[PDB]
């Protein structure tokens, strides 16, 4: 990592700082996955090995639950895939390790195959990851123990297990340092370890964005970075108010952020936009609605697992209409529910409903999110793809170009996603 260095960032543990200028769109560095796993729901849609999306992926003939571009990808994936190939046959319907277990199994396999420092650990090694072991409550430890039991239960034929203490440290490290890989529409693809990328601290006004080229992580400047400046990503969805962001940061990462966004709260008021109405909603009425909104968000998070698509849409409508007594359409809590509703429409292949939702989401998104934001870019892309399918060519092309302009900065001009999107314009 030539023009960067590891340092002690006061109050933030270890960090990464620049030793040379980076301009907007510059590639700071890339980092090959140390370990990674394609999410179960994407099997048969993306190659397990390289994450390429393709119809007609070649199926593993033993387990019938792993798919590849070709024999090369299948062969290359085998050292990792063998941890699950036979167990999936043996266990059948009962094979259900969490994705965290699946990834941690591959970390252990990699440590056996390649004990020495890898090219993904030039500045920070997996073994050096922060765990926050001393901060875990009974709830978190109970979860880690359940994962350790699943790891032993499902992987015992192919993996050597370290002792319980070591596995607790490892799973905690995975929690603190683990990445999720998303596609160009920000759909969940899988989980990965990128040790050098894990070195970067958080800010709610980040100067870099991490994107993915298959299983390769790339890090590009979204603000000008000068020598001596610390390099920050955002660990979280930047849509939400300062309190909401920090509750998540404390809960998952055990810190409170003190960036300019969290210090000033300059953007909080517009995020929680209140209807004028001439006779304004009172302070405690506004307090109560924010509390209810944050509760329905959680209520919905778990509601997905049971309820039907029509049922989920119903509760989006109901909460939307309840909040609209006080909240503007641009209100972040209203945006959240609208965004969930859009996802339900897309699954239902109700393209027109999806589109009507996207159109009400996009302008507020552009306001609340930073200048270059993958959340904004992916919304433009979904919009453009929806317009194109409805044969709204002009509107489609416009929205796709909006996506490209952001993506050229975050993903690089030469990124395969940009070529693909340009081909959707030429077709
Ligand atoms: C992915 S690690 C980042 C590298 C880490 N600081 C280290 O020394 O290994 C995530 C952890 O870094 C720390 N951290 C990251 N950003 C921070 C910030 N802005 N303020 C305080 N601590 C931060 C927290 O302890 C968090 O759990
Ligand atoms: Zn492949
Ligand atoms: Zn198999
Ligand atoms: Zn912040």
From Swiss-Prot:
Zn(2+) 2 binds at residues 60, 63, 81, 85. Changing residue 184 to K: Strongly reduces methyltransferase activity on p53/TP53. Changing residue 426 to K: Strongly reduces methyltransferase activity on p53/TP53. It is an enzyme of class 2 (transferase). Zn(2+) 1 binds at residues 47, 50, 69, 73. Its main location: cytoplasm. InterPro entries: H3K4_H4K5_MeTrfase (IPR050869), SET_dom (IPR001214), SET_dom_sf (IPR046341), SMYD2_SET (IPR044419), TPR-like_helical_dom_sf (IPR011990), Znf_MYND (IPR002893). Changing residue 182 to K: Abolishes methyltransferase activity on p53/TP53. Keywords: Chromatin regulator, Cytoplasm, Metal-binding, Methyltransferase, Nucleus, Phosphoprotein, S-adenosyl-L-methionine, Transcription, Transcription regulation, Transferase, Zinc, Zinc-finger. One of its GO terms (molecular function) is histone H3 methyltransferase activity. Gene3D superfamilies: 1.10.220.160, 1.25.40.970, 6.10.140.2220, SET domain, Tetratricopeptide repeat domain. It catalyses: L-lysyl(4)-[histone H3] + 3 S-adenosyl-L-methionine = N(6),N(6),N(6)-trimethyl-L-lysyl(4)-[histone H3] + 3 S-adenosyl-L-homocysteine + 3 H(+); L-lysyl-[protein] + S-adenosyl-L-methionine = N(6)-methyl-L-lysyl-[protein] + S-adenosyl-L-homocysteine + H(+). The modification Phosphoserine is found at residue 278. A zinc finger (MYND-type) spans 47-85. Protein-lysine N-methyltransferase that methylates both histones and non-histone proteins, including p53/TP53 and RB1. Specifically trimethylates histone H3 'Lys-4' (H3K4me3) in vivo. The activity requires interaction with HSP90alpha. Shows even higher methyltransferase activity on p53/TP53. Monomethylates 'Lys-370' of p53/TP53, leading to decreased DNA-binding activity and subsequent transcriptional regulation activity of p53/TP53. Monomethylates RB1 at 'Lys-860'. Interacts with RNA polymerase II and HELZ. Interacts with SIN3A and HDAC1. Interacts (via MYND-type zinc finger) with EPB41L3. Interacts (via SET domain) with p53/TP53. Interacts with RB1 and HSP90AA1. Belongs to the class V-like SAM-binding methyltransferase superfamily. This is N-lysine methyltransferase SMYD2. The lineage of its organism: Eukaryota, Metazoa, Chordata, Craniata, Vertebrata.
């Amino acid at each position: 990592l030539g023009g960067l260095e590891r340092f002690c960032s006061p109050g933030k543990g270890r960090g990464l700082r620049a030793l040379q200028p980076f301009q907007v769109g510059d590639l700071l560095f890339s980092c090959p996955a140390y370990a990674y796993v394609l999410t179960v729901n994407e099997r048969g849609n993306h190659c397990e090995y390289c994450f390429t999306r393709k119809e007609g992926l070649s199926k593993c003939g033993r387990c019938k639950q792993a798919f590849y571009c070709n024999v090369e990808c299948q062969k290359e994936d085998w050292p990792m895939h063998k941890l699950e190939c036979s167990p999936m046959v043996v266990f059948g319907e009962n094979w259900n390790p969490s994705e965290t277990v699946r990834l941690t199994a591959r970390i252990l396999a990699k440590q056996k195959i390649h004990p020495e420092r890898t090219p993904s650990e030039k500045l920070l090694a997996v073994k050096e990851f922060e765990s926050h072991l001393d901060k875990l409550d009974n709830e978190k430890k109970d979860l880690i123990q359940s994962d350790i039991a699943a790891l032993h239960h499902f992987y015992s034929k192919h993996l050597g297990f370290p002792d319980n203490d070591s596995l607790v440290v490892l799973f905690a490290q995975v929690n603190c340092n683990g990445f999720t890989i998303e596609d160009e529409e920000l759909s969940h693809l899988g989980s990965a370890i990128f040790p050098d990328v894990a070195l970067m601290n958080h800010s709610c006004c980040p100067n870099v964005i991490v994107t993915y080229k298959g299983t390769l992580a790339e890090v590009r400047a979204v603000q000008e970075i000068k020598p001596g400046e610390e390099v920050f990503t955002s660990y979280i969805d930047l849509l939400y108010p300062t309190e909401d962001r920090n509750d998540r940061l404390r809960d998952s990462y055990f810190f409170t952020c003190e960036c300019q966004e969290c210090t000033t709260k300059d953007k909080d008021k517009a995020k929680v936009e209140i209807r004028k109405l001439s006779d304004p909603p009172k302070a405690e009425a506004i307090r109560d609605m924010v509390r209810y909104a944050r509760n329905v968000i959680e209520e919905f998070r778990r509601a997905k697992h049971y309820k039907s698509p029509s049922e989920l849409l119903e509760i989006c409508e109901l909460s939307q209409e309840k909040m609209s007594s006080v909240f503007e359409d641009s209100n972040v809590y209203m945006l959240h529910m609208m965004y969930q509703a859009m996802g339900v429409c897309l699954y239902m292949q109700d393209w027109e409903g999806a589109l009507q939702y996207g159109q009400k989401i996009i302008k507020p998104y552009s306001k609340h999110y930073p200048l270059y934001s993958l959340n904004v870019a992916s919304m433009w892309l979904k919009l453009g793809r929806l317009y194109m399918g409805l044969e709204h060519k002009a509107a489609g092309e416009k929205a796709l170009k909006k996506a490209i302009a952001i993506m050229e900065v975050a993903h690089g001009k030469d990124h395969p996603y940009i070529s693909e999107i340009k081909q959707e314009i030429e077709s």
